[model samples]
Target chain A: AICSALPTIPYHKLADLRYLSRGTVSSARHADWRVQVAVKHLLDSERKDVLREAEILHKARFSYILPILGICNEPEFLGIVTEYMPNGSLNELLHRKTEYPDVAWPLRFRILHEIALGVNYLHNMTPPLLHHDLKTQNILLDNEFHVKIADFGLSKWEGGTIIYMPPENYEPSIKHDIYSYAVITWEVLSRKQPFEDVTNPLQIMYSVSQGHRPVINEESLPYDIPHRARMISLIESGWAQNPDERPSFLKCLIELEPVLRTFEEITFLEAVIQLK
Target chain B: AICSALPTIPYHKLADLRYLSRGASGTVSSARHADWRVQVAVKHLLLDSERKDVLREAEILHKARFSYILPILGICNEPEFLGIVTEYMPNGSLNELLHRKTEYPDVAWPLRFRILHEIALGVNYLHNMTPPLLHHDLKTQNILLDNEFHVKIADFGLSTIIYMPPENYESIKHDIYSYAVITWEVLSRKQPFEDVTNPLQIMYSVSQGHRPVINEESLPYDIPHRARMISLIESGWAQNPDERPSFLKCLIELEPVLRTFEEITFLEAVIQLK
Candidate 1:
């Protein structure tokens, strides 16, 4: 009888705040029909600040952005619950070498393409939602390694690292995001953090402000690969000192879509499988 | 002409969970997301009826995002399970650090002052909000510590059970009273009313305008700033609710002490304590 009771234990009916995971933000899990759902809670005081992001998510109905599942509101707390991605983030995949050493050209190009698509979607919004912090960390991936932009906390005109930030004054604009996206493109291609050797944030600020950018190795990409030069040129142009000179996400998509079309899912899958 | 183009998540994103704390409405545990590659604190509400309360807490946390405030990342509401997740503080609560002197013996004056100032800042932000969020329970236990011993005020909800004065339990000044007790505890590294066995007796004494005796030995009396700090504590613990200084006033008074030390010196003190 005791053994039979274990299966029918009604553990889910109990009021338990099951800890899931934490980052700069906090997370929890609730069991729904035996399926665990992830939840992100905000203080009641921050409801207004984060509710904008929730509204943004609702309006941003795109394939490359993280989707909001529902809004959890109580008298004391406000939560924007979203679908949990199993593959973590692009930052982890790029930096944690041993775990994901085989991110080949096909997947890399796919990620770049998806990112451009996502950013274009944000820029094309009514007032245009500028993702000020566009770095590898914010680019999350699902179980299948598809791109989903996360962390809108710094999406507004908030302070971010000088490395990814444009040289211009602190202003919210689509061009700022384009410059950051250029840096992210470099990060995705080389699988290295931008200015990894630089310790001081101020130093990075000065360097980038003085028209300095990440050093690209010709050897990093196979010389024989098709559209290699075009890709590199796109990165250089995206990081143009004058924000106006940077090509829009539409131009980026036009240049990238053709390159991405050349590779198939099988090619990417094979590369991933062979790594194991 | 440029034509327009545009476009936007759920559950099973968390796994490999472990228990962390248990509260009246729910149980909190730490878990990992294989995909997100991040650690999170999950609050699972056991009862279905209390889902609205947990959701309210989640909304408040969402709105109360700040440097000193502990942020709630998300919420999971299934028919059977209702939970809210927040950032996990690795260093634990201020209450534990103060009482467990053997493990954390080096909590210096600079660090203590920093902690007190941060608490004031967090509370001030709450009070400054549109409706003014009053953390009725501002005890040391509710004050959590991050990895670097940075203060993150926790448990800012509507229904928290804590000892309060009978006369004006619902007033904003109630938090000030609790803050005063916390200030005394941080300075002395002693539990409030430790000598008294009964909680009711302690409450009764506090109601009768009795406050904790300050430990002169805990702080350097000769130092002018230290002396000022003691005065601030005294004012904070004033028997009359109207007599206690607002958090904004407390912040203004505490700013000078915080400014005296450089960031590097303050960090050195924190490292030494660790």
Candidate 2:
């Protein structure tokens, strides 16, 4: 059995809980713990599931994983507190064009690389904590747009999100996140929503499972993006209909490492400053 | 022709110019205008070669005329003298009101919410303007108050580094970020980053998404519409400027918040406030 003896953080200790934009969880909030943590409160019915997630999160700590601070359990309150990521999720950064008008290539590539690092950490975990619900919304960023993969450890499908899904949740394999990772990679490069034209959920599921992927012509992965062949190849292979063909996150990191050095630190800094 | 539209008071027409205080840009003094015959706050610029630059603030005030915005009375365009005259706020800066426990031991949440709402209204107007005026520098110190604790956002004069965004630039989001800090100060009635002494340290910490300490102790849970207030503060001071909501959106978020309280409550708060 997963450990029941988890670190306890009292309800009152989690103070100044301003409502964070909602997650799949009922109501997510953050408070300044001098550490500034995101607090996810579970309903009476969901405490067992939350406890399971907390136990998994306790063991799965890494640089890129969204680190859990502690769990709050009182007579009235059942909650989990984790470090707050201030820059918001990558979904906002990639999709909100007017907000992030001048996001340069260096930062985007750095984001892609850091995300690879994050997913790889999850994949390498003991018995592997498969992040079944990996999506752009779950991929949060720090003040400097560094990646911090969130909502992992709790491997369950309550449903609602509409990102790339190979239905690998049924199979429960490490390669399932790999397929989503490919879609996320392409998303960072394209800076466009996946399958925008596909009208219905069934159509998307049918199309995606039917070997359809985001169009990767010169237009989508333009010449300006650098090493288009290497990136596209990775994307295609990562999201291959057969999850077995999808390369490991370790492979994805190696492929992205060379792309990281194309721009200098000063270039990244200038872009970061201009966006700020 | 538009440049000449600004009301100009000859330097000598202003009688009894009393030195009040000097800040980052220049000195602020109260002057009694002969024509207008009103006690007005006059801002004087010490360094500048261009005449158009001095008139810039007057132009801003002229167009940005609104209930909450600091009212521009006239411009001082005398040779080698650049000054802006505006209405003098008697209640003093919001910073003083919040900090001075002896004077205002118990400020009302309605008044605080109203101040925040009114500030949003003013900023929304500015952002909606064709050329869009950005109050690049916004802080509690720059926020002026009236007899009834209503807000009068100033700094057509100059600014502070504390209320500024971590990115250290000028934009609508920059104003939003500053506004968020002011929101926290208003609710908590405490100075932001009070412990840190080094200026460079603040810059570095803020760049890394550091904000003022928020706890149940400083901001009591029982305050009116605290959840909404917390939401606004959280969203406003977001590390990513783009993630920071626009003034228009901010106004909408607080629409229900201010309505929950009524006229008598504000009156009582003001009457009790000494």
Candidate 3:
């Protein structure tokens, strides 16, 4: 039917729904149509944005972008249902030491590549949705630690983490997300918290305006990652106070794709089996 | 399994949701599932101090489904909001039907009696459950009505204090006293003691042998089987806790009164009221 209605999930059919965690909205899990999916309760204000994002993702259904299953709008159950990423979040994998200690390279490179690939795809869209809030937490991971970017700015209440947010936001261009993506790239390489010394968000924002960025050192960026010097330079250029200095996500993707390919496909599989 | 069948409703999924009504701890709202397209009434108990208690109520409601019991559809377990979704009753509480709203005089006597028997039947089911789920508090306000004026006893133990017995009986017998008070209100079509000032005042008066008026002037001599019904009410709210009848006993007594009027008589009364 050409009607092309929004996917409406029945409230009664949401079986085995359990709390996953909270994002901008409270998220839960249930197997809708036998596939595990995450359900996020959208604020009444975000319902329109949620529906619009769902429609875009429904059309823009491809890799690295989190797949939306349907919207559960049984009136009171107003939420967007998306594929549940069981590998949890990139943030958890990066920081949670007990889980994946000595996290490897091939996996990390692809995660960065996937982040750029996903964002570049979005940037290439008709109206070009810049996922203004890009962070390790929003970058979810699948069973094999593949990147699946979630929370595509549907939350109007999303406060930009000053570390990821460009200096020139509140009115931004595609350069804004690229700047954030650059911070995420550095966070991925370093596996270190950004501005650990600068605890205050406002303080961090002020510091970023004055040429502050995450430290690049032996422990932070480490000597092991391929093209370490190039990534260090990319990190520096991406978070440049002038938004124009930041490379496009496509340009970043073009640069990082070869870094990922440096390791054979077997090496990727080996990282998944041992570290995953 | 002792677990509930109540589906987990994500807080965000509570679309078309808004609240202005108050509840035991949180708020209540009449909301709709944009997809389900059915009107629903949802209430969120404050999650912080009442999580275990809320989960307790959910399990109890899941096991308690009778003809006159309000159905538990699902629950939303989100931080800051812990919601319980129930089947929305369009006709409002028996409280509204009996006392709250004013232009509701045409309510038939058969309808009133039927409500009494239906409520009795519901409480009887609760008392007969595996571990015998006690209503603890039974009143006109908690007794909801369906579209056709059918009784759907609601508001089970989100916890209550007002509709309690004088001696702190703390048993199903206490519910009987409250149920008896409800009967008098239904018979008279008035609040138990519309003149009572405060909560403690009513409890004090009740402790000193004050019960709702039950007589021919209010109940009227014209009501068929009026004498037997009043006798049952007297036994239900008896000062001696041991003297009060069980919900099953109340149902047995009210059954004959209901059958005295033909089945279609009740049906016709419902049609006319609607």
Candidate 4:
């Protein structure tokens, strides 16, 4: 009988499932290639959603977007194989001071610029993919410290928390990504979790629902930076009360392009290595 | 709204199709996917009886997913139409790159070595599969190139199961024999048994233990690695299949040659060729 044509990776092929999170992500070796994969053990009812994620990944391919190598569509072994990111995530790099203390301003600027470029590419796609979950944790770094946006599973039809999410109704829109990007910008600059002072999650949500946003302190940002004033202004505009007032990623890229040009790739790469 | 996942592309999705070539049992054409907005190569079966062959190829391609292996996008099956879709390669086949010397005259050492190494990796992956898939057709014509001149093995219509009985099939060495022929072609940039026009004559000569003459002029004779390269090529074309090296061994020999060149050198050479 002619079998179905999806890539069927045998269960045995996946070795050393180092779990990233329970039932979400795992790092495994497929032959010689070490890959980070998002595996979903599907119930009969959940097959459609899991398969849909595989299809979305199959269609979406860009320089800044993590590429899906293949899929294991067997009944028991349903997952998508992707290129591994050795440098972990932006969140870890930002918060974990000892592990990454020497994160220079040039590297931080590059990360922000690359993230904008990535989100811009996603929005410019044919159907315009919206990254619903755009947090520092979702932004992964490769060997060369290049930004690769990961986790598109919940992007199409899911709602995130209020702290990073837009103040308006929960819905999938390009504006939602812009809002999340603004929150990420704040987090990157401050190097602190969003609403860290607030003890209760619901209080943070309630405050965010109101007009309050993360306070942009001059002490948090590099004071002697060349474009320090401009960076702070951009961050302020990004988290504006009105979603309509927020700049598109393309506009953000235009503003950040000149700032990014000041540093060489080697300069930042050396800095990244030292941080290790 | 939750969009439907990508599935088997219907025949209607393909538009502005231009016929490319006619193969033994199928015809290849370049077409645009109206929805995906990408160019794709579609191989349409000419005969209704060849459905099983197309399915077999699809299954094999599905199972054999490696970097060097060309990926099968999807299948289009209808009452009157049966086709297989794959990502379109702009650079075309290795046969064109090798034979069309005027267009690509300065095919450098690094690129050639890389191509050979990638092909070896692809074949090795296939051989390492559960039942050990054998690519019966391993000629240069079947090895396609992407925009970067990277190898992507295609044309698995003649592939067979290595675990099949001795009476029904030959061993994996059959692929090794074909690979040896490909190796010679890549090195010399000349068709195997070029002087002989008759198919039967070539088959008889090959079966009689006669192989294609390796052109010393084409190889880098001045280099110190020339002897080793020649020896490797000779061993590949050994009369007995048992004497020939596995794709893994071929890779081992190739690694040193490739390791000598820097990445920038390869890029510069590729740019110069372009």
Order the candidates by TM-score, highest first.
4, 1, 2, 3
Off by over 4 Å in 3: A1-276, B1-4, B158-162
Fnat, model by model in order, equals: 0.00, 0.00, 0.00, 0.03
Kindly list the per-residue Cα lDDT of model 4 for residues A115-171, writing each as its tens digit: 887788677666688887788878988755778898777767334456777777433
lDDT of 4 by residue, B1-274 (tens): 2222223778998998999877724888999765454468898865655787887776666556556788666778777678888778888888888988889987877777778777877787778666777876777778899756778998753742211212223266666666666766777777677788786676567667677775565554654367777777777767766887887777777777777876545545555564
Chain B of candidate 2 achieves a TM-score of 0.90
Model 2 achieves a DockQ score of 0.01
Please rank every candidate by lDDT, starting with the best. Answer: 2, 4, 3, 1
Query: Judged by DockQ cut-offs, is candidate 3 incorrect, acceptable, medium or high?
Result: incorrect
Q: Model 4, B122: alpha-carbon shift in Å? A: 1.0
Query: Per-residue lDDT of B185-231 in model 3, one digit per residue for the tens?
Result: 88888766667778777788878877777766678998778889789
Q: Which candidate should be chosen as best, given DockQ against the real structure?
A: 4
- Candidate 4 has a TM-score of 0.62
Per-residue CA lDDT of model 3 for A1-276, tens digit only, reads 011223457767576677777633434433223334677764465557656666655544435678665667666666677777877888898899887786788888878887887777667654566777788888888756778888765422145456788777734466777788788888888888999887788888788777878888996877877899989888888889887777877667667767776887656555666663
Can you write out model 1's per-residue Cα lDDT over B1-274, one digit (the tens) per residue? 1111111003476786789877624788888533333457887755545667877777776666555778565666666556776768877789888899888877767778888888887887678665788887677777888756778997785642223544654377777777877887888877666688777777677778777766565544644376787788778777777888888778767777788875555455555654
**Candidate 4, DockQ to 2 decimals?**
0.07
Query: Between the candidate structures 1 and 4, which one is better when assessed by DockQ?
Result: 4
- After superposing candidate 2, which stretches have Cα over 4 Å from the reference? A1-6, A23-33, A153-157, A167-172, B1-274
| Residue A205 in model 2: lDDT | 72
TM-score of chain B in each prediction: 0.89, 0.90, 0.89, 0.87
